[PDB]
Scaffold this active site. Structure first.
Site, mmCIF file in Angstrom:
data_model
loop_
_atom_site.group_PDB
_atom_site.id
_atom_site.type_symbol
_atom_site.label_atom_id
_atom_site.label_comp_id
_atom_site.label_asym_id
_atom_site.label_seq_id
_atom_site.Cartn_x
_atom_site.Cartn_y
_atom_site.Cartn_z
ATOM 1 N N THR A 1 0.845 -1.185 0.000
ATOM 2 C CA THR A 1 0.000 0.000 0.000
ATOM 3 C C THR A 1 0.882 1.237 0.000
ATOM 4 O O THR A 1 1.919 1.280 0.676
ATOM 5 C CB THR A 1 -0.973 0.039 1.186
ATOM 6 O OG1 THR A 1 -1.541 1.351 1.264
ATOM 7 C CG2 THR A 1 -0.277 -0.303 2.504
ATOM 8 N N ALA B 1 -14.542 -0.612 1.403
ATOM 9 C CA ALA B 1 -14.028 0.157 0.276
ATOM 10 C C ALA B 1 -12.905 1.072 0.746
ATOM 11 O O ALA B 1 -12.728 1.313 1.942
ATOM 12 C CB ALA B 1 -15.134 0.982 -0.385
ATOM 13 N N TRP B 2 -12.145 1.603 -0.212
ATOM 14 C CA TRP B 2 -10.970 2.383 0.147
ATOM 15 C C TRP B 2 -11.266 3.857 0.404
ATOM 16 O O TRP B 2 -10.386 4.558 0.911
ATOM 17 C CB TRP B 2 -9.875 2.258 -0.930
ATOM 18 C CG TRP B 2 -10.341 2.453 -2.353
ATOM 19 C CD1 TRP B 2 -10.517 1.475 -3.295
ATOM 20 C CD2 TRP B 2 -10.670 3.697 -3.002
ATOM 21 N NE1 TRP B 2 -10.944 2.030 -4.479
ATOM 22 C CE2 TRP B 2 -11.051 3.388 -4.326
ATOM 23 C CE3 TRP B 2 -10.694 5.034 -2.587
ATOM 24 C CZ2 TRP B 2 -11.448 4.366 -5.237
ATOM 25 C CZ3 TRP B 2 -11.092 6.001 -3.491
ATOM 26 C CH2 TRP B 2 -11.470 5.661 -4.800
ATOM 27 N N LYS C 1 -12.710 -7.543 5.807
ATOM 28 C CA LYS C 1 -11.598 -7.386 4.869
ATOM 29 C C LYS C 1 -11.564 -5.964 4.334
ATOM 30 O O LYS C 1 -12.444 -5.584 3.539
ATOM 31 C CB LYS C 1 -11.691 -8.366 3.700
ATOM 32 C CG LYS C 1 -10.463 -8.258 2.759
ATOM 33 C CD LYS C 1 -10.723 -8.906 1.389
ATOM 34 C CE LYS C 1 -11.343 -7.928 0.414
ATOM 35 N NZ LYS C 1 -10.397 -6.825 0.016
ATOM 36 N N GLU D 1 -7.672 -3.659 -0.366
ATOM 37 C CA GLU D 1 -6.222 -3.792 -0.445
ATOM 38 C C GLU D 1 -5.548 -2.453 -0.700
ATOM 39 O O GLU D 1 -4.340 -2.325 -0.467
ATOM 40 C CB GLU D 1 -5.826 -4.787 -1.544
ATOM 41 C CG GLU D 1 -6.021 -4.277 -2.972
ATOM 42 C CD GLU D 1 -7.452 -4.452 -3.483
ATOM 43 O OE1 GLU D 1 -7.681 -4.154 -4.672
ATOM 44 O OE2 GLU D 1 -8.346 -4.886 -2.711
ATOM 45 N N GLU E 1 -20.642 -3.397 -10.227
ATOM 46 C CA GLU E 1 -20.331 -4.636 -10.935
ATOM 47 C C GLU E 1 -19.657 -5.651 -10.020
ATOM 48 O O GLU E 1 -19.907 -6.858 -10.134
ATOM 49 C CB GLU E 1 -19.468 -4.341 -12.159
ATOM 50 C CG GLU E 1 -20.241 -3.682 -13.299
ATOM 51 C CD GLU E 1 -21.505 -4.450 -13.688
ATOM 52 O OE1 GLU E 1 -21.394 -5.627 -14.099
ATOM 53 O OE2 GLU E 1 -22.612 -3.875 -13.582
ATOM 54 N N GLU F 1 -23.895 -1.900 -0.482
ATOM 55 C CA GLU F 1 -23.870 -0.445 -0.603
ATOM 56 C C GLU F 1 -22.991 -0.123 -1.800
ATOM 57 O O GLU F 1 -21.767 -0.248 -1.725
ATOM 58 C CB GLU F 1 -23.328 0.214 0.668
ATOM 59 C CG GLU F 1 -24.148 -0.071 1.922
ATOM 60 C CD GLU F 1 -25.368 0.840 2.058
ATOM 61 O OE1 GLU F 1 -25.483 1.816 1.291
ATOM 62 O OE2 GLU F 1 -26.214 0.580 2.939
ATOM 63 N N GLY G 1 -22.424 2.008 -5.884
ATOM 64 C CA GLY G 1 -22.227 3.330 -6.434
ATOM 65 C C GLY G 1 -23.526 3.953 -6.892
ATOM 66 O O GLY G 1 -24.601 3.363 -6.808
ATOM 67 N N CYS H 1 -19.752 7.635 -2.891
ATOM 68 C CA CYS H 1 -20.796 6.935 -3.639
ATOM 69 C C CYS H 1 -22.044 7.793 -3.819
ATOM 70 O O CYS H 1 -22.698 7.734 -4.866
ATOM 71 C CB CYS H 1 -21.143 5.624 -2.933
ATOM 72 S SG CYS H 1 -19.797 4.397 -2.982
ATOM 73 N N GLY I 1 -27.997 -0.847 -4.574
ATOM 74 C CA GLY I 1 -27.776 -1.635 -3.379
ATOM 75 C C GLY I 1 -28.913 -2.575 -3.042
ATOM 76 O O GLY I 1 -29.921 -2.663 -3.742
ATOM 77 N N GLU J 1 -27.863 0.377 5.803
ATOM 78 C CA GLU J 1 -26.983 0.545 6.948
ATOM 79 C C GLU J 1 -27.497 1.714 7.779
ATOM 80 O O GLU J 1 -28.281 2.539 7.302
ATOM 81 C CB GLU J 1 -25.520 0.761 6.521
ATOM 82 C CG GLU J 1 -24.873 -0.525 6.003
ATOM 83 C CD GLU J 1 -23.391 -0.371 5.624
ATOM 84 O OE1 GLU J 1 -22.937 0.764 5.356
ATOM 85 O OE2 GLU J 1 -22.691 -1.405 5.567
HETATM 86 NA NA NA Z 1 -2.874 3.256 0.246
#
Ligand code: NA
Ligand code: NA
Ligand code: NA
Ligand code: NA
Lengths: 489, 489, 489, 489
Positions: free
Chosen positions: C25, C150-151, C175, C178, C230, C250, C252, C284, C458, C462
């Site tokens: 990362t 999500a990031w 999780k 990444e 997707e 949840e 986009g 989103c 979705g 939440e």
């Molecule tokens: Na990063």
């Protein structure tokens, strides 16, 4: 008399009273004697309670869906008999046939219909405490409930009080106003014809002393009363002092209608007129303090007076009439006294202000739709519920001012605003101290919407899911599945 | 005195009364003067109401989560100060330190903790009427609420009444029993230290006349009272007659405990003992009519008497004690009079029955744990709440008989059964006319579980989600998005 | 690297993976290597599930109030560590420190705090069928739940998914993306320090293949995923095909913001800017189709462009910055491709439109705040979620037109209107096909407010009370107290 | 054929398909051809969706009470036509006329009746955030929903899926099992006759490929499927992968019935027989693993076999019959294969075990009521749902053992216990991993009681208030009454 000798309804039939007393009900449009009604004695109320206790047991032993179907049939019968009941209600109250045909039975049946469908949805809770113990609640019928009606909406009030009581598995003993005793007996007949067991809806008759017999009776679990504030205080005091009954009170008001400078003024004037003169001004929720912002005051008052001049005052038996007499001579004397008070205290008389005495009007209790302008907060007509067709119009400068003056009352039944602005509509309503609030409308009372008073305008609520819940009492059950750990060891 | 001069708590500080009157509180185990307490005047109650109105405004203007955090901090302080508060409560009530250390503050804080977390979950409804109009409700604070406590659980009752009131955004003026005035002031200090604004929890002091000042005050929206039935009737009557307040009443009982022939008899005897002698028999929900089925009567009574002989009667300041004195000499006189009545009416004295007067007991108000056998339904000790450590044991033959006799009372607070059988446990409880029902246990009152009386044992409920809802009032808002259709056209 | 070697969190400790694989990362503002992270293998996911099953049992055996207190302590630790977590989140995401310090941990903790207090209010129902039989429900934990983050809001999403799961007595295997693997490990440490049992919140690491391991695992009862449409379709398909898991998605959106001719145009421009460029356009719910009524189009666009020119583009580590880089080079390539597409299809470039490459910006993934005017419904930039700072402005003539075009999409996440008019505000919002609707504001997501998508944006929700309920499964229990009537007789 | 050419029901009328394909339905008691049914094409499903979208708009524009009344009329028509529908259902399914006359239409109508009355009680929430902002939710119709039925309860499943969908304002496209296509068309006719607008209940016909057309269609918001686990997994996967539909799955089970040593053994045997052989063993919730505690095993098995020998196997058209043929030859082949498997794996054949081929039975698909004793957990007949009349009886020693083995399955639909003991009844049920739990009874499915599966036996629920709520989608609306504070300033 027009409708003959009337009496009590106990144990699924009409029944003689044992008081040796009767009272008369008249048509307030003509003075015609409508009926001579037997007044219930203390023994009769005792008998109505024994009858209700017996009927309640059979009623509650049915499934919720069996109760639902019987109440749904009662709705069908009320819809079929709408016009016959509307004529009777018009004769007894003096309200226009155009109102009783379109409102009184329709909306009474609406609430029975609503609760009939919800009778299956009364649920307790379950909550675990630990693996070895959990709690569940039962929502059990209260038992025998008492309903005490007012004369301005006789059968509608009978429907609104009896519907959630019966749908929750209670019996109800109902006492109509002695001013309007007739239509409640027709509802009792309809419930019986629909399949309601004997005693589940009983009707007793008489003045406030019979109401006191109900409020004090040790076999009655809850009393629901609609009427004036000062009578409601006596009812609640007696209901509590006698046997700690649950209570519902739907009382009077001095509800404010706030017309802001960005109101649709046509809409505001229509609203103010509806809010003051429907049912000849005899509505607890009426917007009888009309606050109007200074910049639109003249334009608004002009629109109001133009609509008031188009009110069709006439015989309530004529379907063209939309404004008839008051319900009694006592009503008329009181309202005229308030009009005298308004004039003496310096309010400006803009419309009406006098009894109508020409032609047939002399035989009735007719007071013209009355409007006062340039009113002050310290006037009697502004401070006190008149319960008649008298609008008080009050100017204001700022939003904070209107809200402060609207709230400066011990009443708290309804309130309303007229404004096109999103922020203003909600923020003003959120600050008004009333249980029933209308934005850009007035007077509609959907079965879904809980209605009742803040402050001295009431206790508890009617309509909505919450009112069905409040015709049950909570039984909490703790189940211990584990070993009971001794406290004294 | 032990604890010195005590006074009122108004606007975030201790404050002098203006009555010129004081009253004394004593340690009922020793007769020691604990404190001299200033009694609130009518002016003081007026000032407490003005103070509460001011504090309520700031409190309600906070977010629900801001109120939650402040109440959660109050919980932390109650947990930290458990032992100091428990000693004070033991001195003032006479209840064993083993009880006040483990129950009174623990469960008081439990309910504040519960409602602190739920403060964010008070929601109105929304329901559409048609595309052009919808309704939403607001659940608004009532405003200024009054709480009137009893002397058997002083700080716990203060916690249970103030927790849902404050969590819903109200202020509360609380009056402890004049018998036990001390611990409520400590709760007021803790709320202030936790961040509760000045006036949101005020404490006034005095006898029932100060309670009447609260019940009658026009600025108080709701009164919640815990005490005897006959006082509760006067409170509710005055609360209604004065200004149509909402009311909660938690009153006394004569609750039945039914021991069936298929009960675990060890469990039943432990339960009966807990249900009669905890807090020296001074608990509204106590199971003071113990019905036992004939076939297990002898075996059950033997087990009960064996446990009663193991009760450790002693100084409440000794942690080995699990049964101390009654709370007052008036209590003692009443309880001994009932014991005299039971003996004269022919009940059999199986245990206790006399005042303890040896050694230190002479300086206190000690009555031995008392058990009557062979009781009859027509006896005074069976019909009337004693509020002391007197168990009445009654034999029965059949399940229908036990249920009929258990229900044949104007009380309706609690009830319970002991049986190993699934069907019998639920079917018997479903037929018992009480708001608080226990199966194979007794006395636990989880914060999740609504508690209150049927019949003359109360009105409304405490604890559970429902009680938070009942510290709000419903405002219904109808939004009209369409054109207002004129009614007068 | 800046933060060193990172790995998994299983059974209350950091733990080595068994894949033999790592992933890197980076800081997207500088290209600095932040960490090398061990990727979970299939065996590791199996071990995380066994660990979660064990921890879930201990967690669910606690009382609801014991869970409440532990989650409340987790809140305290998140508040104390706000600034340290905010710096880590800024490094990993590239979002401005002014955002991560004020929003990400604050609102993550807000939702844990909310559900911690509600953990005691999960109740089943009870309903009688007849005197001899009744039903109660239990709301039992689902068991082991999976969360896939999500990031764009790494720790906030971890908080929002784990809070209702844990408060309802579940365990969760989480999780993170990444792209942003770091902050989820800090949340795991905090839960452990707060008292959460080992295995109740486990963290596994890796790309979408590790997400697929979770979605397919037969021991996982529910999967909650936040990400692109997707990918969400593949997650839901696998979650259902593998073992009929419950699912929350949840996803986009292409949410419409409708600026009417009676909008406050200053307010509208502020809203449009917030709704398009917060978190560098990576939200989103962003209002990326800005519909503006023709009569105010020019005045509105002028206000928008003036505010866009005042956006402070800079290093996200500088607290003066309110707009930094995108989260990755893949993000940058995609967004620039959309800008190319918008230009080629004839949209007018009003602001931004290019990568920043001067001075330090060259080492990061910076795209200027970009605005397109004169857009058409058939353009790619209008039809597709860009997930970057690209506003598309579209003119319209009538209210029906704006509503029709706003709804003509397979997305359905959010929508909003700006108008001063009461009727228009509600009637327009009621017709918009989106789960999250804002009137005269944008972007606030209170813990009380359920949020989720219509259509392909979705499944499920939440936040709000409803989401706590949906981390339990209903067990219905029918108790027969009477004789079972044989069907085969 | 008996009932002639059958086709689709779209837009308020019967309609030809456009596939050029038909399929036959037979009477499984005789092999008689009942009907030749046109199969819907992809174009037909498209047309059914356009038709449903149009009808849904008119249906949702009605008031909730208008929908209530129309559904109540549909109930009346189902009650009137009970016997005609029961004969049709008996012919198509092979289930005894004694069942279809008393159960299928009765309980189908029961659920429509229940939801008709609740149609007025679908409410959103309201919650304030601060004086300047509040949230309300709308519970809006999902839109067009799809229902896919099973052949064991054709019209009842059509009623149970369509009732909450329509009561919440949705339209539904329903596909019956190709094995039992007839009765769903009669329900469509009844809805139309009751006043349901054209397209609100459409019927398409065909095998699983037509089901896949529905599950994949982008215009369908939710799919509800009842059938086998493996088909349900494919439905849910396609429903999610295609367009992120909401899903309900009611699938098969291997539900445990635990007979404890303190069970009423007569009651237990009656229950086990009902739980295994009603509807010829073709019920998803059947208690097909019968665990019996060792000490009562012999006495229980004796009672079971005595009742099984009294089952009246016969023509389903004979009202004396209470057990007829299976629904198809494919069913028969499968069930006989399981009986072969049970015998080969060493289970003891205690009753039945063979196809009936004497006299008229040869022309039908009749398998005798079959009981296996001395079963093992590793047997195929114990592990797998048979969906036929095959009881597996398993001995156990301890309560923990029975609970562990009952739970050791990937199924989780139903479970039940038989015991006279209060503690054991609840504590055992609380530990069983099933959504539908029965104590001292089996098989009743009240409209109030949510029903569905744990684990791989389902997703979501049917019946109860919760299922009406889950035929709506939540729209959250935040109203900002204050100034929008710029984020980019
Ligand atoms: Na990063
Ligand atoms: Na009259
Ligand atoms: Na004292
Ligand atoms: Na067939």
């Amino acid at each position: 008399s027009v409708y003959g000798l009337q009496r009590l309804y106990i144990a699924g039939a009409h029944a003689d009273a044992t008081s040796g007393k009767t009272f008369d009900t008249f048509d307030p449009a003509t003075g015609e004697l409508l009926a001579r009604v037997q007044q219930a004695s203390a023994d009769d109320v005792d008998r109505a309670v024994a009858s209700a206790r017996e009927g309640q047991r059979e009623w509650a032993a049915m499934t919720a869906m069996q109760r639902s179907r019987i109440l749904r049939r009662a709705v069908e019968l009320l819809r079929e008999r709408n016009d016959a009941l509307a004529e009777l209600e018009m004769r007894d109250t003096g309200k226009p046939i155009a109102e009783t045909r379109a409102v009184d039975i329709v909306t009474g049946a609406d609430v029975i219909e609503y609760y009939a469908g919800l009778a299956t949805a009364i649920e307790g809770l379950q909550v675990p405490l630990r693996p070895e113990s959990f709690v569940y609640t039962r929502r059990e019928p209260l038992g025998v409930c008492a309903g005490i009606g007012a004369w301005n909406y006789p059968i509608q009030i009978a429907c609104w009080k009896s519907a959630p009581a019966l749908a929750a598995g209670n019996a109800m003993i109902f006492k109509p106003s002695e001013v309007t005793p007739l239509s409640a007996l027709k509802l009792a007949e309809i419930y019986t014809e629909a399949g309601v067991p004997a005693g589940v809806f009983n009707v007793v008759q008489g003045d406030g002393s019979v109401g006191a017999l109900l409020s004090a009776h040790p076999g009655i679990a809850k009393v629901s009363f609609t009427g004036g504030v000062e009578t409601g205080k006596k009812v609640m005091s007696l209901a509590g002092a006698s046997s700690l009954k649950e209570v519902t009170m739907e009382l009077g008001g001095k509800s404010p209608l706030i017309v802001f400078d960005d109101a649709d003024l046509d809409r505001a004037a229509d609203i103010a007129v509806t809010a003051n003169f429907f049912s000849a001004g005899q509505v607890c929720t009426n917007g009888t303090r009309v606050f109007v912002q200074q910049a639109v005051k003249d334009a608004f008052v002009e629109r109001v007076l133009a609509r008031v001049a188009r009110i069709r005052v006439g015989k309530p038996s004529d379907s063209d009439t939309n404004f008839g007499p008051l319900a009694s001579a006592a009503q008329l004397d009181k309202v005229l006294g308030y009009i005298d008070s308004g004039k003496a205290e310096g309010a400006k008389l803009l419309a009406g202000g006098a009894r109508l005495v020409n032609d047939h009007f002399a035989s009735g209790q007719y007071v013209a739709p009355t409007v006062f302008g340039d009113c002050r907060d310290d006037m009697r007509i502004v401070r006190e519920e008149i319960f008649g067709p008298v609008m008080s119009i009050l100017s204001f400068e700022t939003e904070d001012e209107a809200i402060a003056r609207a709230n400066a009352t011990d009443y708290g039944l309804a309130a309303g605003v007229v404004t096109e602005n999103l922020s203003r509509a909600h923020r003003a309503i959120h600050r008004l101290e009333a249980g029933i609030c209308w934005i850009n409308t007035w007077g509609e009372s959907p079965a879904e919407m809980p209605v009742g008073g803040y402050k001295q305008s009431g206790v508890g609520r009617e309509n909505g899911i919450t009112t069905l819940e409040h015709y049950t009492r909570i039984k909490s059950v703790q189940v211990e599945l584990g070993r009971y750990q001794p406290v004294f060891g």
